[PDB]
């Protein structure tokens, strides 16, 4: 039955009008087995062929039952990395094996494939390729994510709040606080939840004054705790007393009582 | 005063405009074709801690300043050097 | 016919029919590969096309593909914006 | 202590059958005090070499760079200088010598005319990356094309990596199998040399009839070290081929890409706070002129990069330099006489009592002109 098929991709082994007669031959009357196989040798024969491997993986998928082990997810792995490896270029292709891997308890092999993709992939596909990858952020947490999202303040500087939840919950108050320093000194950014300047000078003193043990001083790290306070005073002088409470708590906060007295 | 020099203020050459405000694409052409004006502008940073000085004291000495003086690179880069010997001053152990 | 038919543009002057034929293949078969020269004598760009093209795939979801593919990628250096 | 130097000798690993893989050798007669001048270079402290001009100062700090590039890969070495053309003659000196030209990499203005034959600044380093990731794609392509693999694996530099590690490597186990095999004689070994369509062009024959098994692996190892060493080149390039920008490429080159980078100590001092904010991690640096250099100014280079774990990462420090030779430049009298601004770190060291070398054979002037400054040596 396959015979005429296999003469005609004989006689046409570039086109790929033959293959496609025989794989929707196959998918009318063949098993399943024999359309893996058909469509696996219509890969290897005709690896740049985009089409032909998306209905391979569209087969591949929807025989997939999700109750099938790692042993399958490590086949489709295979050939999603091979379709990678000849195909490197198609935003389409790295969101599908992206999304495997998020359907995949796999989140370093995850990480490492996503910079994969985007030392592939360019600037204008980074948009999706970012879309995609903050969710497995959010999901992931901790110092992974904090890399993931310096990295997105590296390409879209937009959520500074959100950062600034990550690292409150993480416990990263040095980078938190340069990281203030460095939005508040942009005069640019406007934040999403309505928070005004001194909504920011707010977080900043509250932040410090939660932390004040855990903030490294000096001009290594670039803060200035009573520089900065002091700056506040000179600047917002409708909440002075306010900042110097906010530095006198963060003085015993710190235990430094003579200071604080001072 | 015996030269009757009053006010220096250091600035930093930031870029070069034509009489225009545009700025200079290629300068190279710009050398070689013919200049159509003989007027220049420069973009330039002020020194901050003389400009707020100015700014406390009520002076106007960006208003009597009536000359522009430039050095050569090789003598004139020490502002650079003096910001990195600063910083390692800030630093603790180098 | 206009279904199938994608509009690159933003393609670079080496950027030629062969190129795009080659390009667009991986999503499908092409019909056609029509790229509009700069047949105007008063421009004086020696540029063989106008940087636009039209690739009409054999079918629409091909062509749909090649447009996703070919959109907002790299091609020949320059970014190429692929619409339907 | 009378040491005993237990002197080992290796076979030299072969890069290839083409004359061009053929390591430069250096060619000098080093006297003693060079040779040991240049083993206090290599061993990890503080070196002073107090050198004549004409005596082959910066042959000897060549030499140590080479050593060092050479022993350890994995350190950095700063080469510090004053002036463009000591910058030019040091990196003319490691041309006729043997360091890669993916890792030197010259830092100053670009203004500067470059006398080498080779543009070593960011913009040229990044130009010769890119001609050689084309010559290497070329030659990945005719690779494929004998091997005859399926599609054109000369697209890029990972394209061409993903082929390497999935058509060579099993073909290169598959041969190192056969070899291992004990009833497997050279002649075997000869034919089961899958690299001969694309080592066609080498010169005939690429394994000799007279040669035994020994030689014909070396010869297969040489070939295969070829290929390695231009897939391990592309796979040098291909963070370039990532970035976009001129910038970012020059910033990678700097931090992680080039294992040897060499500017002036001018330039050092005014790059010292984006070199730490790039976070540099030099190991070992090597610097000339010190007596034409002031102390501050060479100290810049010695805090360039952070302190970590409460000290420095640095190894290597290697002084070259005459203090008798001439002050630096500094136009100030009082800052000359009374503030002492003009003696250097080599001659604060060699009053101090630090060991210092001393080279104590010219090779640049007349017998005549070698008494006439040696009644001051």
């Known amino acids: 039955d396959d015979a005429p098929y296999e003469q005609d991709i004989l006689r046409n082994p570039g086109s790929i009008r033959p293959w496609l007669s025989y794989i929707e031959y196959k998918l009318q009357h063949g098993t399943l087995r024999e359309q893996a196989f058909v469509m696996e040798r219509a890969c290897v024969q005709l690896p740049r062929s985009y089409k032909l491997w998306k209905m391979f993986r569209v087969n591949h998928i929807s025989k997939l039952n999700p109750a099938i082990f790692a042993t399958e997810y490590q086949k489709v792995n295979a050939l999603f990395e091979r379709a990678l490896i000849l195909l490197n270029k198609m935003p389409r292709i790295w969101e599908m094996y992206l999304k495997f891997l998020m359907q995949q308890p796999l989140v370093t092999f995850t990480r490492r494939t996503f910079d994969r993709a985007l030392r592939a992939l360019p600037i204008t596909q980074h948009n999706r390729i970012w879309a995609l990858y903050r969710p497995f952020a959010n999901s992931a947490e901790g110092i992974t994510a904090v890399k993931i999202w310096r990295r997105y303040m590296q390409v879209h500087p937009e959520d500074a709040e959100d950062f600034i939840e990550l690292l409150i919950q993480c416990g990263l108050y040095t980078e938190a606080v340069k990281k203030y320093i460095e939005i508040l000194n942009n005069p640019?950014?406007?934040?999403?939840?309505?928070?005004?300047?001194?909504?920011?000078?707010?977080?900043?003193?509250?932040?410090?004054?939660?932390?004040?043990?855990?903030?490294?001083?000096?001009?290594?790290?670039?803060?200035?705790?009573?520089?900065?306070?002091?700056?506040?005073?000179?600047?917002?002088?409708?909440?002075?007393?306010?900042?110097?409470?906010?530095?006198?708590?963060?003085?015993?906060?710190?235990?430094?009582?003579?200071?604080?007295?001072? | 005063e015996r030269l009757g020099l009053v006010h220096v203020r250091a600035a930093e050459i930031i870029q070069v405009l034509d009489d225009k405000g545009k700025a200079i694409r290629d300068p190279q052409a710009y050398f070689d074709?013919?200049?159509?004006?003989?007027?220049?502008?420069?973009?330039?940073?002020?020194?901050?801690?003389?400009?707020?000085?100015?700014?406390?004291?009520?002076?106007?000495?960006?208003?009597?300043?009536?000359?522009?003086?430039?050095?050569?690179?090789?003598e004139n880069n020490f502002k650079p050097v003096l910001e990195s010997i600063q910083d390692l001053t800030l630093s603790e152990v180098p | 016919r206009w279904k199938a038919t994608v509009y690159v543009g933003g393609l670079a002057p080496a950027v030629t029919a062969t190129?795009?034929?080659?390009?667009?293949?991986?999503?499908?078969?092409?019909?056609?590969?029509?790229?509009?020269?700069?047949?105007?004598?008063?421009?004086?760009?020696?540029?063989?096309?106008?940087?636009?093209?039209?690739?009409?795939?054999?079918?629409?979801?091909?062509?749909?593909?090649?447009?996703?593919?070919?959109?907002?990628?790299?091609?020949?250096?320059?970014?190429?914006?692929?619409?339907? | 202590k009378v040491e005993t130097l237990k002197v080992s000798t290796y076979k030299?690993?072969?890069?290839?059958?083409?004359?061009?893989?053929?390591?430069?050798?250096?060619?000098?007669?080093?006297?003693?005090?060079?040779?040991?001048?240049?083993?206090?270079?290599?061993?990890?402290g503080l070196t002073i070499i107090v050198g004549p001009p004409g005596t082959g100062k910066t042959d000897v700090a060549v030499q140590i760079i080479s050593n060092i590039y050479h022993n350890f890969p994995e350190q950095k070495t700063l080469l510090v200088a004053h002036s463009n053309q000591a910058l030019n003659q040091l990196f003319a000196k490691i041309v006729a010598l043997d360091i890669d030209e993916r890792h030197l990499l010259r830092l100053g203005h670009g203004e500067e005319e470059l006398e080498?034959?080779?543009?070593?600044?960011?913009?040229?380093?990044?130009?010769?990356?890119?001609?050689?990731?084309?010559?290497?794609?070329?030659?990945?392509?005719?690779?494929?094309?004998?091997?005859?693999?399926?599609?054109?694996?000369?697209?890029?530099?990972?394209?061409?990596?993903?082929?390497?590690?999935?058509?060579?490597?099993p073909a290169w186990a598959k041969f190192n199998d056969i070899i291992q095999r004990e009833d497997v004689g050279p002649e075997d070994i000869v034919r089961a040399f899958p690299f001969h369509a694309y080592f066609s062009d080498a010169p005939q024959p690429l394994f000799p009839p007279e040669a035994d098994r020994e030689t014909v692996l070396e010869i297969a190892n040489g070939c295969y070290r070829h290929i390695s060493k231009i897939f391990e080149e592309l796979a040098d390039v291909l963070p370039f081929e990532i970035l976009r920008r001129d910038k970012d490429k020059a910033n990678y080159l700097l931090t992680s890409e080039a294992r040897i980078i060499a500017m002036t100590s001018t330039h050092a001092a005014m790059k010292r706070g984006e070199i730490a904010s790039l976070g540099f991690q030099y190991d070992n640096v090597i610097m000339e002129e010190a007596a034409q250099i002031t102390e501050i100014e060479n100290f810049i280079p010695l805090?360039?990069?952070?302190?970590?774990?409460?000290?420095?990462?640095?190894?290597?420090?290697?002084?070259?330099?005459?203090?008798?030779?001439?002050?630096?430049?500094?136009?100030?009298?009082?800052?000359?006489?009374?503030?002492?601004?003009?003696?250097?770190?080599?001659?604060?060291?060699?009053?101090?009592?630090?060991?210092?070398?001393?080279?104590?054979?010219?090779?640049?002037?007349?017998?005549?002109?070698?008494?006439?400054?040696?009644?001051?040596?």
């Open chain 1, 188 to 262: 640019k950014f406007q934040s999403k939840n309505a928070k005004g300047h001194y909504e920011l000078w707010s977080e900043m003193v509250d932040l410090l004054v939660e932390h004040a043990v855990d903030i490294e001083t000096g001009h290594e790290t670039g803060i200035d705790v009573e520089r900065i306070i002091r700056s506040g005073i000179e600047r917002f002088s409708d909440q002075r007393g306010k900042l110097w409470s906010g530095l006198a708590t963060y003085w015993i906060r710190r235990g430094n009582f003579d200071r604080a007295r001072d």
């Open chain 2, 33 to 74: 074709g013919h200049t159509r004006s003989d007027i220049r502008k420069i973009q330039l940073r002020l020194d901050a801690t003389s400009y707020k000085a100015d700014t406390e004291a009520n002076r106007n000495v960006y208003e009597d300043i009536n000359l522009i003086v430039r050095r050569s690179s090789r």
């Open chain 3, 19 to 84: 190129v795009l034929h080659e390009a667009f293949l991986p999503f499908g078969e092409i019909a056609e590969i029509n790229l509009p020269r700069n047949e105007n004598p008063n421009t004086a760009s020696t540029e063989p096309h106008r940087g636009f093209a039209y690739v009409e795939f054999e079918d629409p979801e091909d062509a749909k593909e090649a447009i996703d593919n070919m959109d907002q990628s790299e091609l020949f250096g320059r970014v190429i914006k692929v619409s339907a």
């Open chain 4, 12 to 44: 030299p690993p072969n890069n290839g059958p083409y004359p061009v893989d053929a390591p430069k050798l250096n060619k000098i007669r080093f006297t003693p005090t060079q040779i040991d001048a240049i083993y206090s270079g290599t061993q990890p």
């Open chain 4, 116 to 169: 080498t034959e080779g543009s070593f600044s960011k913009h040229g380093r990044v130009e010769s990356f890119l001609d050689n990731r084309q010559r290497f794609l070329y030659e990945v392509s005719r690779l494929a094309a004998s091997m005859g693999a399926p599609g054109a694996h000369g697209n890029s530099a990972e394209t061409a990596g993903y082929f390497n590690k999935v058509y060579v490597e």
């Open chain 4, 303 to 377: 805090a360039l990069q952070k302190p970590k774990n409460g000290q420095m990462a640095l190894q290597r420090v290697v002084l070259c330099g005459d203090h008798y030779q001439n002050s630096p430049v500094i136009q100030g009298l009082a800052f000359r006489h009374y503030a002492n601004l003009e003696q250097s770190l080599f001659s604060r060291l060699v009053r101090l009592g630090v060991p210092t070398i001393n080279l104590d054979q010219q090779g640049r002037a007349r017998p005549s002109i070698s008494n006439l400054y040696r009644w001051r040596y």
